[PDB]
C-alpha cells in the first residue's frame, strides 16, 4: 500500500488546480506569467519579478536561429516527410545537448567550477589552454569584440540592471576581456551568457540555498531553458514547412562521399 | 544556378542580428512582444493584438502542468527515473500526446467549426457523431466533471468574454456542452476543446487573417503546438523534480498486470 | 484490486521467461529464429518455417538504403551533433510512415481494399487514375520493366516458390503488368511487395482467420516490419559518423532560400 | 569543385543492386548470411565467422521481451493507450533505454575490459567501485537473482563456451560474479553484462579485427545497438496487443502518488 511515487510540482486532485502550492487563480492574480510559473514548477520557489522577467527572455532569445542549425533542420526533414508535429518537434530536439544547445549547460558548470575553485579569470585562462580544453560560452562564428552580439548585449543590459549581484558573470566578463586579446571572435556568447547569468539567479536572488542551486545547475536545468525555448521555433519550423507545402526531401548524392570497404577485404 | 533545396519564412539569423518573421529582435525586446508574441511572430507570422498575445501567454500558463498520473508526465518519470537526460525523457512524455491525452486542439477546432459553418444545430451534431461513432474531441476527462469543474476552462473563457470580439464558435461549443453534460456528467468541453474553439474565434476575428489564412493554420496543426509547448514547462518540472528526490529505477508491479498468453 | 493492465506476449514471472507460451529454451530447440521470435511476439502465433524466413528476408532486404533518405540524414545529423545512440536512432526513425518508409502499410491496405471489393486489376488502375490517387507500392525512382529492382527479384522468387497461395501478391503482378504499359518504370516496388506478400502470408499460411489478418494489417504491422528492419541501417549510420569522427553539422546557407514577410506587413 | 559535406561507408544505393559493406545484396542471400551477417556488414565493416552471426542472432533473440512492467514496455504500452502510432509508441519506450534499464552493455564492456586489462583482481575491483561509489554495469536486477536464475544468461553462457575460441573476459566477469552474489542475491550478472562481455571477446578473438578494431567498437557505442534492435521487436509486439486488446487511455491512480508539495 505504500505509494510507489513521489511528486512535489502541482496537485491536480482538487477542484482547483495548485502550481506548487499556489493554486492556478492566485497565480493570475499575481500576474506571475511564464516565467513566474517555471519558477514554480521546475523549482517550487516564489521568484522575484525580476528574476521571472529574465527567465521570459531568455526564452525569447533561443526562441529560434534559423533553419540551418542541427534541430531546425531535422524537424524540417521530419515536416517535409509528412508526419505530425510531435514526431517532428522531438526528432529536432534529441540533437540537442552536446555540440548543438548544450554550451548554456556546460558554460555553467565551466565557470561555476573556476569560480568556486578561487582560480582567477587569466589562471583559468592559461589553464584552460594547457589543458586543449575550450572555454564554453566562449567565441562565435560571426561576431566580435567591435561587432556585438545583440541577444548578448539586451540580456546582458537586463542582468546588470536589475541584478542586485552578478559575481559570476563579472568573472566571465573578465574572461572575454582576455581571450578577446588573443583573437577578437573570443566574445562571450549568449550560451555564456545565459548561462553564467543564470547562475547568479540561482545564487544570489535569495530564493535558494548553495546547495539547491548547484543541484539545478547538476540535474540540468539550463538544458531545459534552451530546451523550452527552441521548441518554439521548432513548431515554427514545423509549421512553416506545411504552409510552404513542401515536399519530401532526400539529400544529393553529389554532397555525399561513399567509401565503402573493398569485395575482398 | 542550382536552385535552393530549403526554403524558409520566419527567422532570419543572417546579418547584423537576429529576425523574427516581419521583426529584428531589438524590436522584438522594445516593443514588449513578449512570448506571446514572439509565437504570434514564429507560428502566425504576424504582429497580433495585445490581449491575443496575453490570451497566448495564458494557454502557455494554463497548460503547464497537470500532475503525475497523465500519460506523458508518466513517461517523463519513468525515464528520469531510469536515468535519461532531459531531452530524451522529455521527449518520452511528448509522445504520448495525441487523440486521447493532450492533442485533440487541431480535431476539436477542426469538428466544432465545420459543425458550426455546416448551419446544424448543436443537438443534431451530438447525434450526427454518436451515430458515426465518432468521439467529440474536446469533450470528456478522466477526472474533471461538473462535479469537479476545471478552472483552466473558466479562467481561459473569462478572458475570452471580457477580450475577444466575437466568440461564436465558443458559443457553440457550450451549447454542445449543455447537451453532453446533461448526458453524462465528465462529458465537460475539456481545455483542448476550449482552446481549440476560441483560437478558431481569435485567428478568424482579431483582424490580422482572412478566413482562408484562419483556415489554413487549423489545417496544418498550429493548435496542438499550444499545449505541447505549454506542457513541456511541467514535463521538464517532473524531470527536474524526480532528479532531485534521487527516485531509482522504476518496475510496474506484477499484480497490476494481468498475463494471459497462448497455451 | 483488478489489474490496469492486460498482456498477452511474454511472461518473464517465473524461473524461465516464456514468448507467448514457449518457454525460451523450446524457442531454440525448435530454432525458431528472429522470424519465429517475431510470430510469437507480435502475432502470438508458431508460424511455418517458410513464413519466419519469409520474415528475416523482410528484415535484411529492408534493412538500409544508404545515407540520403530522411531519416538515415537524421541520425547521421544527430550522430554529428554528438548524440547517443537511441537519441539519434530514434530522430531518425521518427521520420517514418508517411512520404517516407510509409508504402508498405499504403500498399497492404490499397491492394487488399480493391482485391476484396471484387475489382479487376484493369479497372482499379483506371479508377485510381480518375480519383488522383497513385498507387502505393507501384513506381521506382531509378529500376524499370527490363532494368529490375533485385530486392523485388530475391523476395519474390522466395515467395512463389514457398507459399502455396499468393492471390494478393498475383492481383498486384496483374496491376504491374497494366501500369508498366503507361510508364516503364511503375513497377511493383520493394514496399509493394513486402506488403502484398505479407497479406498474402496472414491470410493463407493457416495461423490466422481472415478478421485476425485484417486486423494485424490495420492496426500497423507492417510499419512495425519497415521500422525494425530499417533500424539495423540507421544504428549502423549512427556507428558510421562516429568511426569516421565526423563534425558537427550545418546546412549551407546557399541551398536554403530566406523569403520572410515583410518588416511593413 | 565543392568538396563533399557528409561521408558515409556502409551502404551504397546509387548502382544496379544494393551493396552493405563489402557485400552486393544478392550475395548476402546467395552466401546465406542472415540477420546476423547483415548486422556484422553495415556495423562492423566484415563478413563475420558463422559462429559469430549466429551469437549476435541468439543475442537479438533472447533480448526481444521481457514483459510489459519494465520501463520500456510500460511507456510503449501507455502510448499505445493514448492512441499513438507504432513510431510514436516504439520511440516513446526506447527512450528509457541508458543506465539503469537496458544500456549497461558498453559501461560493463568498457569498466570489466578496464579492470581485466589492468590486471587488477576481481575482488580488487569490487572494492574498488564500492569505495568510487560506483555502480558495476552489468551487474545486479530488480526481479533475477540467484534464487530465480536468467535462463537468457545460461543459454548465451552456454552457446559461447561451445562455439567462441577464447572467453577471458567472460571468465573475469563470472569471477566478479561469484563475489557480487555471495553478497547480496540479487548481484547477479545480468543480460547487459553477459552480451557486454561476451562481446568484446568475440571481437577481441573473432580474428577479423586487431585489437585496435574491437577497442574502438566498444568505444563508439555498438554494443548497445544490440539490446535496442532487439528489444524494439518486444516493445513493438506490446504496442500490437495494447492495440488488439482495444485498451483505453491509461491515467495513474493517485493513492500510488505521494503528493508533498510547499506550504
Ligand atoms: C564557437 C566556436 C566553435 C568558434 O571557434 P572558431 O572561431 O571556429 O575557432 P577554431 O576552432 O578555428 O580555433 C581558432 C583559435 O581560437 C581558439 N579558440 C576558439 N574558441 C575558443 C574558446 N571557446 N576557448 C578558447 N580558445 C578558443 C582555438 O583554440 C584556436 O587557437 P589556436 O590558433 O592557438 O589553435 C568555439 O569558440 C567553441 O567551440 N566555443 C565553445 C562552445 C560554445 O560556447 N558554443 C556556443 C556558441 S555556438
Ligand atoms: C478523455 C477521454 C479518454 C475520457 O474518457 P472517459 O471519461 O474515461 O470515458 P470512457 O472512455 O470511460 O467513456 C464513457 C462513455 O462516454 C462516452 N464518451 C467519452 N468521451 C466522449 C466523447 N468525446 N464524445 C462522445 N462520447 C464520449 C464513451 O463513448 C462512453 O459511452 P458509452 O456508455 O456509450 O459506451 C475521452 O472523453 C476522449 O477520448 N475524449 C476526446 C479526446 C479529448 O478531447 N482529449 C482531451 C482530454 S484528455
Ligand atoms: C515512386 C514514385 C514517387 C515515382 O514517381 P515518378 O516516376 O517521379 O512520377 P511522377 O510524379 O513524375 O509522374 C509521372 C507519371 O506517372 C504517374 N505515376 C507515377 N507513379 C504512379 C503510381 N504509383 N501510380 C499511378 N501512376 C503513377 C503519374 O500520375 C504521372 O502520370 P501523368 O504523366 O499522366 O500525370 C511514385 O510512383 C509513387 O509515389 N509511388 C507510390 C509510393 C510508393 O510506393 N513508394 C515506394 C517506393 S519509393
Ligand atoms: C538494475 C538495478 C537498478 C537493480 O537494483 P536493485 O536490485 O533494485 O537494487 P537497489 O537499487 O535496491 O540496491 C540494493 C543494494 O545493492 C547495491 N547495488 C545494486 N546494483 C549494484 C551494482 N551494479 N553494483 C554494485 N552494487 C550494486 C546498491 O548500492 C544497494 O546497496 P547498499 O545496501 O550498500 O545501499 C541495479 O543493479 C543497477 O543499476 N545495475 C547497474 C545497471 C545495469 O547493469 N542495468 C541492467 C539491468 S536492468
Redesign the interface.
Same mark, same amino acid.
Given at each position: 500500500k505504500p505509494?510507489?511515487?513521489?511528486?512535489? +510540482?502541482?496537485?491536480?486532485?482538487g477542484?482547483?488546480?495548485?502550481?506548487?502550492?499556489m493554486?492556478?487563480?492566485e497565480?493570475?492574480k499575481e500576474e506571475?506569467? =511564464?516565467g513566474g510559473?517555471?519558477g514554480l514548477?521546475?523549482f517550487?520557489k516564489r521568484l522575484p519579478k525580476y528574476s521571472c522577467q529574465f527567465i521570459?527572455?531568455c526564452?525569447?532569445?533561443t526562441?529560434?536561429?534559423?533553419?540551418?542549425?542541427?534541430?531546425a533542420?531535422?524537424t524540417? =526533414?521530419?515536416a517535409?516527410?509528412?508526419?505530425?508535429?510531435?514526431?517532428?518537434?522531438?526528432? %529536432?530536439?534529441?540533437? +540537442? %545537448?552536446?555540440?548543438?544547445g548544450?554550451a548554456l549547460d556546460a558554460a555553467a558548470k565551466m565557470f561555476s567550477k573556476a569560480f568556486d575553485s578561487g582560480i582567477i579569470p587569466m589562471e583559468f585562462v592559461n589553464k584552460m589552454k594547457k589543458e586543449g580544453k575550450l572555454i564554453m560560452g566562449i567565441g562565435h562564428r560571426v561576431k566580435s569584440i567591435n561587432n556585438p552580439d545583440?541577444?548578448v548585449q539586451?540580456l546582458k543590459d537586463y542582468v546588470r540592471q536589475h541584478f542586485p549581484a552578478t559575481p559570476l558573470l563579472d568573472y566571465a566578463l573578465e574572461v572575454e576581456k582576455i581571450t578577446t586579446s588573443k583573437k577578437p571572435n573570443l566574445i562571450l556568447n549568449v550560451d555564456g551568457l545565459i548561462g553564467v547569468a543564470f547562475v547568479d539567479m540561482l545564487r544570489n536572488c535569495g530564493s535558494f540555498t548553495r546547495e539547491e542551486a548547484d543541484?539545478?545547475i547538476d !540535474?540540468?536545468?539550463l538544458?531545459?531553458i534552451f530546451?523550452?525555448g527552441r521548441?518554439? %521555433?521548432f +513548431? %515554427?519550423?514545423?509549421?512553416?514547412q506545411?504552409?510552404?507545402k513542401?515536399?519530401?526531401?532526400?539529400?544529393?548524392?553529389?554532397? !555525399?562521399?561513399?567509401?565503402?570497404?573493398?569485395?575482398?577485404?
Open positions: 505509494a510507489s511515487f513521489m511528486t512535489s +510540482i502541482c496537485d491536480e486532485r477542484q482547483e488546480l495548485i502550481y506548487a502550492g493554486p492556478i487563480t497565480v493570475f506571475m506569467g =511564464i510559473v517555471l514548477l521546475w517550487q521570459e527572455m526564452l525569447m532569445v526562441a529560434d536561429h534559423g533553419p540551418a542549425v542541427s534541430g533542420h531535422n524540417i =526533414i521530419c517535409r516527410a509528412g508526419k505530425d508535429l510531435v514526431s517532428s518537434l522531438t526528432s %529536432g530536439l534529441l540533437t +540537442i %545537448g552536446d555540440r548543438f548544450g545583440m541577444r539586451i543541484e539545478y !540535474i540540468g536545468a538544458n531545459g530546451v523550452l521548441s518554439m %521555433g +513548431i %515554427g519550423h514545423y509549421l512553416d506545411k504552409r510552404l513542401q515536399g519530401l526531401y532526400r539529400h544529393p548524392w553529389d554532397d !555525399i562521399s561513399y567509401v565503402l570497404p573493398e569485395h575482398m577485404s
